[PDB]
Design an enzyme around this catalytic site. Structure first.
Site, short mmCIF file in Angstrom:
data_model
loop_
_atom_site.label_atom_id
_atom_site.label_comp_id
_atom_site.label_asym_id
_atom_site.label_seq_id
_atom_site.Cartn_x
_atom_site.Cartn_y
_atom_site.Cartn_z
N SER A 1 80.35 -13.36 21.34
CA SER A 1 81.71 -13.72 20.87
C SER A 1 81.82 -13.53 19.36
O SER A 1 81.61 -12.41 18.89
CB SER A 1 82.01 -15.09 21.34
OG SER A 1 81.69 -15.15 22.71
N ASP B 1 86.14 -10.52 31.73
CA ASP B 1 86.11 -11.59 30.70
C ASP B 1 87.55 -11.97 30.36
O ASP B 1 88.36 -11.05 30.15
CB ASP B 1 85.32 -11.15 29.47
CG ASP B 1 84.79 -12.31 28.65
OD1 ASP B 1 85.61 -13.17 28.24
OD2 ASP B 1 83.56 -12.34 28.44
N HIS C 1 82.39 -14.99 34.08
CA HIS C 1 81.52 -15.70 33.10
C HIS C 1 80.39 -14.77 32.65
O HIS C 1 79.64 -15.17 31.73
CB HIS C 1 80.99 -17.00 33.71
CG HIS C 1 82.05 -18.04 33.85
ND1 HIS C 1 82.64 -18.65 32.76
CD2 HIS C 1 82.61 -18.59 34.95
CE1 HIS C 1 83.53 -19.52 33.17
NE2 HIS C 1 83.53 -19.51 34.51
C1 LIG Z 1 81.73 -16.34 23.51
O1 LIG Z 1 81.90 -17.40 22.88
C2 LIG Z 1 81.56 -16.16 25.04
C3 LIG Z 1 80.79 -14.90 25.46
C4 LIG Z 1 80.62 -14.70 26.98
C5 LIG Z 1 82.90 -15.98 25.80
C6 LIG Z 1 84.13 -16.58 25.19
C7 LIG Z 1 80.80 -17.35 25.55
O2 LIG Z 1 81.45 -18.22 26.10
N1 LIG Z 1 79.47 -17.34 25.48
C8 LIG Z 1 78.69 -18.14 26.28
C9 LIG Z 1 79.16 -19.17 27.15
C10 LIG Z 1 78.29 -19.93 27.94
C11 LIG Z 1 78.77 -21.03 28.89
O3 LIG Z 1 78.08 -22.03 29.03
O4 LIG Z 1 80.00 -20.93 29.69
C12 LIG Z 1 80.49 -22.00 30.51
C13 LIG Z 1 76.92 -19.66 27.86
C14 LIG Z 1 76.44 -18.64 27.03
C15 LIG Z 1 74.96 -18.35 26.93
O5 LIG Z 1 74.21 -18.86 27.75
N2 LIG Z 1 74.48 -17.59 25.94
C16 LIG Z 1 73.94 -16.26 26.11
C17 LIG Z 1 72.48 -16.32 25.69
N3 LIG Z 1 72.22 -17.02 24.42
C18 LIG Z 1 70.79 -17.34 24.17
C19 LIG Z 1 69.79 -16.26 24.44
C20 LIG Z 1 69.22 -15.49 23.42
C21 LIG Z 1 68.27 -14.50 23.72
C22 LIG Z 1 67.89 -14.30 25.05
BR1 LIG Z 1 66.62 -12.99 25.60
C23 LIG Z 1 68.46 -15.07 26.06
C24 LIG Z 1 69.40 -16.05 25.76
C25 LIG Z 1 72.95 -18.30 24.39
C26 LIG Z 1 74.43 -18.05 24.56
C27 LIG Z 1 77.33 -17.89 26.25
#
Ligand SMILES: *C(=O)C(CC)(CC)C(=O)Nc1cc(C(=O)OC)cc(C(=O)N2CCN(Cc3ccc(Br)cc3)CC2)c1
Ligand SMILES: *C(=O)C(CC)(CC)C(=O)Nc1cc(C(=O)OC)cc(C(=O)N2CCN(Cc3ccc(Br)cc3)CC2)c1
Lengths: 815, 805
Positions: free
Chosen positions: A673, A751, A783
């Site tokens: 994001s 998305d 998601h």
């Molecule tokens: C941005 O803010 C968006 C992107 C999809 C969409 C508006 C977002 O919501 N991100 C996002 C949302 C959730 C969530 O809980 O929704 C209900 C979770 C996550 C999430 O888990 N991530 C992706 C992975 N990130 C850590 C990570 C780093 C390296 C590696 Br190998 C694995 C994981 C944490 C954020 C995102």
């Protein structure tokens, strides 16, 4: 100093490695106990003071539990409260309503609305209760069900964007609003009643669009009038967007829905059946009564139901008003234009909107959930607690008394109101809190007001910008603030409505989240002075995870005049005389803080995995991140994308001149994001520092994002031509590298917040510009990465990509 | 034997190599028409008219054919513009008697006159807009052959007509409303729907009756036969508006024939229009029939004709339909019941030809009807694969019997009830070679000398040639075009000239005019003489090395042909990385003696870099007869790669410069498919696959194509499963840099749907993939070729490519 090269695993090896270390989680774990309610037992001879009701998961349904609070404990031992299921089940419950008078629970559980009784006159269950379906004739899923607090036989819900009511004893069902038609297409039918539209749900966290009057007005007949204030939205002028159904998305600089307030007046006979329903509209239009208002940010009722209140925002979100709205401002919807004239004259000129508070800022208004109305003791005064940044630049609690006097505006004169005809004088405004730290009022953070001891409980950053703590202070002679939670943890709390207990969900870097109950007392000599004692555990820690190595928190004295905080994951099995490749993980945007003293093992576990493979990992809260006041947040006003990578590079160079094991020639950056945005900005503006950017669901064009977010931070695009230009990566595709394997885009096709459109228009301008890029698409699941199937492939592709293009020997030999 | 390593170029250097060597091409003269000058005193026999691009508008030109030439010299005809211009014309209509041209150019339908009784212009003509009140684009305009003052066209899917002298305009069909959306209103008249345009190359859905019948008053009746189509039941799909796509195994449109009977007084004004419908629904009259593949009229307009296919496309029928089978569209069922019972029961559909196959019918444009010599007979030429398994011309006489079946007996007709006795069925051509009937290829019939000119593969499956044969005593077939070129021809309507457009591997396309003659003793014998050039060859392209055509006898029992592009500046004792280019699907042949330096120019660029490029026409490819085509019936995806590998081993054991450890495969569409299938089935052979706009799931593709080659999905669950790569993600490799998908987001027949669903299943299976998207053009093509060269270099060709593994 010799470079370290990450062991070049294979896709099969890296898959298995990931599958072995994931013995837990899917980006979240079982939802911790939440949405607590305290009910007094009121049994002189029983062992228990209180029953607590909460939602939790024991992969299980989120459902309702209770626990017994004993009057006394073995202060030697630790009492683990046991979870007693409230419900029989043969989906999940995300929220619930309660009416203390009757002991009535109301909740949605899948398609069905259910109710059960516990803790009222009928007493306390020792066994699971059978949920009773609220029978309906409505074809479609009912949403957002709420008990009438004045009478718990009656509920309201939404069905195809109209408001309905249903009586859970008589089974009478009745439609209140006639604004939407399910059979017409959303190109033709774009009006709704009692429903928060997209931007208010997504950018202001307001999920409901109707509010029950908490009191009933009795009739001469032995009946009563129940009332519902609701917003009505006309979304006709609003842009539509198609995502493999359609929907209404106010793009920056385009029309927000047309909004008013309405009032449903429901007449009930002595036997509890509907006599009539009168739909009511504002005496004058919304644009006339509340000039310059774009957004209805919050609404509800004064405690006695004498007034509706709203928190109203202008489009620029630099003016906030609190306004009282007497139900006498509404008249019946009437088609006969002479009969309507007679209803207009029948209401006195003395009956007028009451702006009891107004504030302005040159930065932005941050909407919050803190607003408490004291019982009225005089007809011409209202007394309330509110929170604001607009006085000092840090969000503090203010106790306010506003005078409710006649407007100079008389509607009889046939004129239109002047810009301040409804402004109430302020009799008194007192700071309850102050200093270089903030009261929290968002994401569950609120106040609990004790009107007997004249105390308010609040959460704040007073002790540290890195921990939320619970505090209490007097609202009558504000002085001493007592910290109620223990240092070395970050706390998320709530307080019993009885003000004799608080619950804390708390964690730190070493320690997964726990949930514990604390009893509150007063020294016999001073009911103002508050102490806490441990009472019981609700949820025990797992304790330090056997594999997970937490990061360390660091800070540096930025040249910008602010301390900046960061997290550092030293590489595992660190060797002397080796410099390791570095992944910077970034969000970097408003309303978020990554660096604090909480457990990062559940959601940021893979930053540990990265470290276990030989990568230094860095996270930094650049200017614009939250919990550091409005001035620090306000650094990027109009300049989103211009200052963030400076802070990231400054902190990375700080760390580099402190640790020789940081190899500045092998920096990758990765975010989602706003973090996806800054990953692209970083490669574009500072290709010298960053070898690779992996951008996940990036904003690439500020005109493709929404009104409520982008206008708050960036104003209207007509007033910030260069901000929008410089801020929009897609407009600058020619500044990307002409060497491949530096740029990787990741996006889901469906998305709903950051549209695929952002990636697709970037791709168009990369192609026109002759620039290389890599792409991973998660074709469904909406998601995208939250759903494990897409998530495991992302983790896998990400680890391989960094191995192949940053970490490994081969990567070095590719350049 | 050492490995050769392509130069490792930067991105910026590859972009430069590509922009420097880069510098569709202008469309060659086509749609020829010969008009006699009939001027005893003047030097010219004929004016020819044609469309051509002189980066210009495709427009109308004429040239003058002189009565004599200087046989020592070569005459270049000059291109004289017909139209006085300061968009393009795709096609035109003409009426010999009036000399009237009719053509769409952008929004506007236009007309001019030349070569009629007004004579021949010496200067460009101002196009005359046909004025309209219609708010929307007019489509598919046609002159009424009976009366050139009358045109027809389509507007918002209804048939209108308009009079270019009187300015009189009139809607004929009220089947669709434009203020109403397309999920509600899926009715169209005179418009061929998606599957017939895309899968049967039928573009018009209405047909002027070529003769007018006089009215006693001194007026007349014009007729228009048309298909009416109801797409209500047909699936809807969307792309970043929406359309009606008959997915395989789902509903094709509801179709009928209709007839508009137009009534004109002596002064050329409309008295009335009666819309008419079939006396019994299409399904009753036309049992088993899914598709209206072709339709038209007999030359004197007595019968309408149609070539009707069943859903399985294994039963073809030619049907005469009298205008007497149609009755006014009547509300009041009482008034209706006379119109029905009055029409004699002798008036029945006449199936003048029927055939069946266990492979499939290939629809084509060859169907000639002779003048009616006798009321109880029809005489025609048709082409069919259905006897010998090669397309050959047949002369047929069918008896036009009164049907056994009566409509007054309130009965329902049996299948053979409308069948016509075949009197006579004489093979005009025969052999292990085919007559061409597709993409412009057709016959011209000389009714005075009883000759038919036709195009075929008689001499080589690699070269199309023009031939002529008697249809009365089929004997010697004479080839009229020269060996060493593939030819695409048309014959003058006067059967005294032909034009060839021809090319071979070394020589870019050329267009020449040939005079046809007979020796005085035998009008039946044909000679040709070079007369003039219309379009000079570019000359050999100065830095293009053509490929060589190879062959191999193959374990399947067929000769298989291929093209081989040798590495430029070839070194001895160096084996070279190999790129297979592939289509491999039905209806296409990549390997023939034609110029490949325009479309496949970048095959030569790959060779210049140090790649061995190979192309092979596997079984299922065309121009090799029906049995060869039939090898993959039900089995698409299962046999194609054997043939490609076989051909690669053939070349590898004959040439040592072919490095079998560094083979790449690349194609588009069906080629994209076989590219995935190749990495799926033969990862031992193919290091890397680059699939462009691939089919990944046959249930996602349309009725007309996939049910022809794979059957209804219900009776081939196994073949649909094994030919669908999206249903087999687990079979792809688990190392990256081997699989690259390319897809346009807005792709119209190979939807992005195929790519997303494969990605969705690749993700399920934890398998790696590279992707390029082209969201909306030269800029896209440029980026693809650059991305492709870079990908092959980095992941097949270069030094770093072999270290990476
Ligand atoms: C941005 O803010 C968006 C992107 C999809 C969409 C508006 C977002 O919501 N991100 C996002 C949302 C959730 C969530 O809980 O929704 C209900 C979770 C996550 C999430 O888990 N991530 C992706 C992975 N990130 C850590 C990570 C780093 C390296 C590696 Br190998 C694995 C994981 C944490 C954020 C995102
Ligand atoms: C498949 O049949 C599709 C895919 C887009 C239709 C779904 C198709 O039509 N393919 C196709 C069509 C045209 C065409 O005639 O449009 C006007 C052109 C092309 C085309 O561009 N190609 C692909 C590239 N080919 C050879 C090549 C090899 C290597 C390199 Br570096 C460059 C070029 C030439 C034909 C496809």
């Amino acid at each position: 100093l010799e470079p370290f090269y990450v062991e070049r695993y294979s896709w099969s090896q890296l898959k298995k490695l990931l599958a072995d270390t994931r013995k837990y989680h899917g980006y979240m774990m079982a939802k911790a106990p939440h949405d607590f309610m305290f009910v007094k037992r009121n049994d002189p001879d029983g062992p228990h003071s209180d029953r607590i009701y909460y939602l939790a998961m024991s992969n299980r349904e989120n459902t309702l539990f209770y626990s017994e609070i004993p009057k006394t404990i073995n202060r030697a031992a630790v009492l683990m409260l046991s979870w007693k299921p409230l419900l029989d089940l043969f989906v999940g419950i995300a929220s619930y309503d309660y009416h203390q008078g009757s002991g009535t629970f109301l909740f949605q559980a899948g398609s069905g609305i259910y109710h059960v009784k516990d803790g009222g006159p009928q007493g306390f269950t020792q066994q699971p209760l059978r949920p009773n379906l609220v029978e309906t004739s409505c074809p479609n899923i009912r949403m957002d069900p709420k008990l009438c607090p004045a009478d718990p036989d009656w509920i309201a819900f939404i069905h195809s964007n109209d408001i309905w009511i249903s009586n859970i004893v008589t089974r009478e069902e009745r439609r209140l609003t006639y604004v939407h038609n399910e059979l017409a297409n959303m190109e033709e039918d774009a009006r709704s009643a009692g429903v928060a539209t997209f931007v208010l749900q997504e950018e202001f966290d307001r999920y409901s669009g109707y509010w029950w009057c908490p009191k009933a007005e009795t009739t001469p007949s032995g009946g009563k009038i129940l009332r519902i204030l609701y917003e009505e939205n006309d979304e006709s002028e609003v842009e539509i967007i198609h995502v493999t159904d359609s929907f209404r998305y106010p793009k920056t600089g385009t029309a927000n829905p047309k909004v008013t307030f309405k009032m449903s007046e429901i007449m009930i006979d002595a036997e509890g059946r509907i006599i009539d329903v009168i739909d009511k509209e504002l005496i004058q239009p919304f644009e006339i009564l509340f000039e310059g208002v774009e957004y209805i940010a919050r609404a509800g009722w004064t405690p006695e139901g004498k007034y509706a209140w709203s928190i109203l925002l202008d489009r620029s979100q630099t003016r906030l008003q609190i306004v009282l709205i007497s139900p006498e401002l509404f008249i019946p919807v009437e088609d006969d234009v002479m009969e309507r004239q007679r209803l207009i004259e029948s209401v006195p000129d003395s009956v007028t909107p009451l702006i009891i508070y107004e504030e302005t800022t040159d930065i932005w208004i941050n909407i919050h959930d803190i607003f408490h109305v004291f019982p009225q003791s005089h007809e011409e005064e209202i007394e309330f607690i509110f929170a604001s940044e607009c006085k000092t630049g840090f969000r503090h609690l203010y106790k306010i008394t506003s005078i409710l006097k006649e407007s100079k505006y008389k509607r009889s004169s046939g004129g239109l109101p002047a810009p301040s005809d409804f402004k109430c004088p302020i009799k008194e405004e007192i700071a309850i809190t102050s200093g270089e730290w903030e009261v929290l009022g968002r994401h569950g953070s609120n106040i609990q007001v004790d009107e007997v001891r004249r105390l308010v409980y609040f959460e704040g950053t007073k002790d540290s910008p890195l921990e939320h703590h619970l505090y209490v202070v007097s609202y009558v002679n504000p002085g001493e603030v007592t910290r109620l939670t223990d240092r070395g943890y970050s706390h998320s709390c709530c307080i019993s409505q009885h003000c004799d207990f608080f619950i804390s969900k708390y964690s730190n870097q070493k320690n997964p989240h726990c949930v514990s109950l604390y009893k509150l007392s007063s020294p016999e000599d001073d009911p103002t002075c508050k102490t806490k004692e441990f009472w019981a555990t609700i949820l025990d820690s797992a304790g330090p995870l056997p594999d997970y190595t937490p990061p360390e928190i660091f800070s540096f004295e930025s040249t910008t005049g602010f301390t900046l905080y960061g997290m550092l994951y030293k590489p595992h099995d660190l060797q002397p005389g080796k410099k390791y490749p570095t992944v910077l993980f970034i969000y970097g945007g408003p309303q978020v803080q990554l660096v604090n003293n909480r457990f990062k093992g559940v959601k940021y576990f893979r930053l540990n995995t990265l470290a276990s493979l030989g990568y230094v990992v860095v996270v930094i809260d650049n200017r614009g991140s939250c919990h550091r006041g409005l001035k620090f947040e306000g650094a990027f006003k109009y300049k989103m994308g211009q200052i963030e990578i400076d802070d990231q590079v400054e902190g990375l160079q700080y760390l580099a001149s402190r640790y020789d094991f940081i190899d500045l020639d092998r920096v990758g950056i990765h975010g989602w994001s706003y973090g996806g945005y800054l990953s692209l900005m970083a490669l574009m503006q500072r290709s010298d520092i960053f070898r690779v950017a992996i951008a996940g669901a990036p904003v690439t064009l500020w005109i493709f994002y929404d009104t409520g977010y982008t206008e708050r931070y960036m104003g209207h695009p007509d007033q910030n031509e260069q901000g929008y230009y410089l801020g929009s990566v897609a407009m600058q595709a020619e500044k990307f590298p002409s060497e491949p394997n530096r740029l990787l885009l990741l996006h889901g096709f469906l998305d709903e917040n950051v549209h695929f459109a952002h990636t697709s228009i970037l791709l168009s301008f990369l192609v026109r510009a002759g620039k290389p890029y890599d792409l991973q698409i998660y074709p469904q699941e909406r998601h995208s990465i939250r759903v494990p199937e897409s998530g495991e492939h992302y983790e896998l592709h990400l680890l391989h990509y960094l191995q192949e293009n940053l970490g490994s020997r081969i990567a070095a030999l590719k350049v």
